[PDB]
Structure formats: C-alpha cells, structure tokens
C-alpha cells in the first residue's frame, strides 16, 4: 500500500527529504552517471520504483544501495521546478529548522550540502539572512549525506522565488562591559 | 543535608550556573542594591544560605524571590577571580555547548546576557571564534534570564585567560552552483 519513496521519506531522520516523482526517475536522462556511483544499480532502481525483484541476507545491501541512489536522485530533483515547489512547502512549514543566530530572529533555513560528492560531509543548513551555514541541532540528522542535497539547492530556490529572500538583520551583537561598548 | 545552592545548580535547566561561595554572599558589600530589585529580600537571602524562616504557603513566593536573588548574585560573582575559575572548569567541560556555525568547527561557547536588566532577554551563548551570539539549542534553557549572566562575563574571562582565545576560522562558506563559485 505504501510506496518505497513515501516510506523512506517518512522515516525518522529523513525529515529533510521530499518525495521525488516517479516520472522524474523514469526518465533515464535524469539519471546519467549514477550507475557508476551505485552498486547493484538496476536492483536499487527497481526497488525505489516498487517493481518486482528476484533467500539472501544480501538484499539488505540492495536496500542500502536503494537509499544512496534515491539520495543522489534527490539532489538533482530539488533543482527542478517541481522539486523546488515541494521543498518550498517544507520551508514554509519550518521543516528544516531555524537559524540559531540571535540577530537572525529565527529565520527559517534550508538544507544544503558542502559537497556534491558522497562521503565528504553530512547535510548542513543554510540561513539566507546571515548567508552562513550551520550544523543541524538534532542528531537524527548527523548521518544524512549532504550530497543528497547538493551545494546549489538553496541558491536555486531563492533565484526562482526571490520574494522569500529576507531583509538584512535590523540589529547585531554589541559587546558591552559594565555598561561600556568595548572592542 | 544538601545545600540550597547545590540543589538549585543541579536542577534541570540550570546547567549553566556555578555555585556561589557562602563567603561571597555573606559580605554585604557584594550585595549592594539587590534589596531594591528583589521582593522578600531578607527571607530570600536566608533561604539561599540555608538559614531558617517563619497563609504560610506564600513561601512559594520566597522561593521565587530566592531564585531571582541568586541569579542576580551570580551575575556579579562570575566576574570575580573565583567565579571565573569555576566557569572556566565548566567551559573546559563543554557545559555551555558548542557553536552551531559549521566553520567554527565546534568551538565551545559561554553563556551571556544581552542585558543586565532582568526581564529583558533570556540567556544566550557567545562564541569567541565568530564573536557572535546564539540561542541555546535546548529549550530547558529558554526560561533562564540572561541578566543572571550579564553582558560582561565572557569578555572578562578571556581577559583573565587570553590563552583560551581561539584562532580565526581557517575556512569559510563558499557558495557554489553547478561547480561555479557564485557572487
Ligand atoms: Zn542566520
Ligand atoms: Zn562560532
């Protein structure tokens, strides 16, 4: 009853993902080159798409491959108009959390990868007000590869939706000692 | 046979406090003016010091007063040599948490008040590497008044202990889109 993609996205720790269309995945032009990064590609793919498979312990490995593949597909997908739209809905809901920087007054953030290359760095969060990047406060997010979001995504969303760019901070930090402005 | 001060500091949410010496509290010169900011001062003070008191349910109010008074005493105490020493121990233990800013590579932080006036702002956390201020990630800390730490404390500690000042971040965030440094 439940689709693999629906299932995966609803797992704990996977709150930053949206659901990629089957349409997108089914167009091989979108998947160029992934078959060189993922073991068991053909099966990982069948799995993502709820197709029928081929009794090993092994199949656990296809699940891991399935997860990596979905991740890499995801980073490409959220650069498309549909992808952006779904993530924007998430953004509006604060799904990605809020900037911890006092003078950003709780600006909602977006997920981002420091690298497009898997295994380099876990997913981070970008604040468009201070335009810097933060480690997610919740540890359920510390094992999600940032390559499944990519370096470009936030910039891409604000380009398509300039109306969501916040204004510069009204105020900033002013260090004080015994009443005096120091430094 | 647990002291009031020991009890308070061990309460959940009070992890950023250290234990003020009785010696300090018993020198009235240290408490100048606090009697004008706190209701039920005399009793709040007796309570802090584990002396004895006398609708005797009211007393709940003396406990609230006692907590405010200790808080205000604390903000004066942590600017002294003994105070700083205790907070440094805490700092070294990461009791106050770590900077969420990716490129600060988990610099440990210090508590800080944006105002020395009670009721203005809840306690914040100061990172000495990026020299900006953050909201504590944990909500158990969102009802602690920053006036119990004050604006001066961090600056004061690094003045007494310059050897703890971190170096500037090696790196910083470099926005990229499809490989390109964008600007
Ligand atoms: Zn920010
Ligand atoms: Zn920092």
Are B88 and B157 spatial neighbours (Cβ–Cβ below 8 Å)?
Answer: yes
For residue B64, the 8-state DSSP code is: H
The DSSP H or E segment spanning A76 is helix A59-77
Resolution limit, Å: 2.8
- What residues does each domain of chain A span? 2-97, 98-157
Determination technique used:
X-ray
How far, in Å, are A150, B68, B129, B130 from residue A117 at the CA level? 8, 52, 28, 28
How far apart are the CA of B133 and the nearest CA of chain A, in angstroms? Answer: 6
Please name which of A78, A73, A145 lies closest in space to residue A113, comparing C-alpha atoms.
A145
CA-based nearest residue in chain A for residue B97:
A137
Contact A135 B102 (CB under 8 A): yes
Q: What value, to the nearest 5°, has the Cα angle with vertex B6 and ends B164 and B8? A: 95
Pair of tokens at residue A3: 């689709």
Q: What is the largest CA-CA distance in chain B?
A: 73
* Same fold? A2-97, A98-157: no
Q: Is B24 on the interface with A (CB under 8 A)?
A: no
Q: What is the largest CA-CA distance in chain A?
A: 73
The DSSP H or E segment spanning A124 is strand A124-127
Q: At what angle do helices A153-160 and A81-92 cross, to 10 degrees?
A: 90
Please name which of A30, A173, A162 lies closest in space to residue A84, comparing C-alpha atoms.
A162
Are B80 and B90 spatial neighbours (Cβ–Cβ below 8 Å)?
Answer: no
The whole-angstrom separation of Cα B103 and Cα A173 is 19
For residue A101, the 8-state DSSP code is: B
How far, in Å, are A100, A136, A144, B176 from residue B99 at the CA level? 9, 11, 20, 24
Contact A152 B114 (CB under 8 A): no
Pair of tokens at residue A164: 């969501």
- In the A/B pair of chains, how many CB contacts fall below 8 A? 63
Contact A133 B100 (CB under 8 A): no
Q: Where do the DSSP E strands lie in chain B? A: 110-112, 124-127, 132-134, 176-177, 180-181
Q: Which residue has the tokens 């995801």?
A: A74
How far apart are the CA of A173 and the nearest CA of chain B, in angstroms? Answer: 6
Contact A131 B173 (CB under 8 A): yes
Does the domain made of A98-157 have the CATH classification 2.40.10.220? no
| Reported CATH class of domain A2-97 | mainly alpha
Q: At what angle do helices B59-77 and B41-48 cross, to 10 degrees?
A: 70
> Do the annotations mark residue B130 as ligand-binding?
yes
């Amino acid at each position: 009853e439940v689709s693999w993609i629906s299932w995966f996205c609803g797992l704990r720790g996977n709150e930053f993902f949206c659901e990629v269309d089957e349409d997108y995945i089914q167009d091989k032009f979108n998947l160029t080159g992934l078959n060189e990064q993922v073991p068991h590609y053909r099966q990982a793919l069948d799995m993502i798409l709820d197709l029928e498979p081929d009794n090993p312990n092994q199949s656990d490995l296809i699940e891991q491959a399935a997860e990596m593949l979905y991740g890499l597909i995801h980073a490409r997908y959220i650069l498309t108009n549909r992808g952006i739209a779904q993530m924007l809905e998430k953004y509006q809901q604060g799904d990605f959390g809020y900037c911890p920087r006092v003078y950003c007054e709780n600006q909602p953030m977006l997920p981002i990868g420091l690298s497009d290359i898997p295994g380099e760095a876990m997913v981070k969060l970008y604040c468009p007000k201070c335009m810097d990047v933060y480690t997610p406060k919740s540890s359920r997010h510390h094992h999600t590869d940032g390559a499944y979001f990519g370096t470009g995504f936030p910039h891409m969303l604000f380009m398509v939706h300039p109306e969501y760019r916040p204004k510069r901070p009204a105020n900033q930090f002013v260090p004080r000692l015994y009443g005096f402005k120091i430094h």
